[PDB]
Amino acid sequence: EINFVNIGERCNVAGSRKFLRLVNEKKYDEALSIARQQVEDGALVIDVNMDDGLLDARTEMTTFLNLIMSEPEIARVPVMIDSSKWEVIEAGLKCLQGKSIVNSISLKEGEEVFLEHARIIKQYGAATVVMAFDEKGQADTAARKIEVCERAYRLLVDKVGFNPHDIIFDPNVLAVATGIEEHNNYAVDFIEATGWIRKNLPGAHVSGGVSNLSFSFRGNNYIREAMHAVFLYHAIQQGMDMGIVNPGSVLYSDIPADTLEKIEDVVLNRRPDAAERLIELAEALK
Ligand X SMILES: CN1c2c(O)nc(N)nc2NC[C@@H]1CNc1ccc(C(=O)N[C@@H](CCC(=O)O)C(=O)O)cc1
Residues that bind ligand X (CB under 6 A): 9, 12, 15-17, 82, 103-104, 129, 170, 173, 208-209, 211-212, 218, 244
Total count of residues recorded for the chain: 286
Classify residue 246 as left (phi > 0), alpha (psi -120 to 50) or beta.
Answer: beta
CA distance 144 to 35: 34
Asked whether position 246 contacts K ion by CB under 5 A, the answer is yes
Binding partner of residue 57 among K ion, ligand X, Na ion, none, CB under 5 to 8 Å per kind? Na ion
Q: Which residue has the closest beta carbon to ligand X?
A: 209
Least separation in angstroms between residue 272's CB and ligand X is 26
Taking the C-alpha atoms of 241, 196, 153 and 151 in order, what is their torsion angle to the nearest 10 degrees? -140
Q: Which is nearer to K ion, 141 or 178 (CB)?
A: 178
CA distance 212 to 179: 15
Q: Which is nearer to ligand X, 90 or 170 (CB)?
A: 170
Binding partner of residue 212 among K ion, Na ion, ligand X, none, CB under 5 to 8 Å per kind? ligand X
Please say whether the beta carbons of 101 and 78 come within 8 A. yes
CA distance 21 to 244: 21
Least separation in angstroms between residue 129's CB and ligand X is 5
Span 51-70, contacts to Na ion by CB under 5 A: 55, 57
Least separation in angstroms between residue 235's CB and Na ion is 32
Q: Which residue has the closest beta carbon to K ion?
A: 18
Contacts 24+ apart (CB under 8 A), 20-26: 20/52, 20/54, 23/50, 23/55, 23/60, 23/64, 24/54, 24/55
Q: Which is nearer to ligand X, 14 or 272 (CB)?
A: 14
Least separation in angstroms between residue 258's CB and ligand X is 26
Least separation in angstroms between residue 105's CB and ligand X is 10
Binding footprint of K ion on the chain (CB under 5 A): 16-18, 211, 246
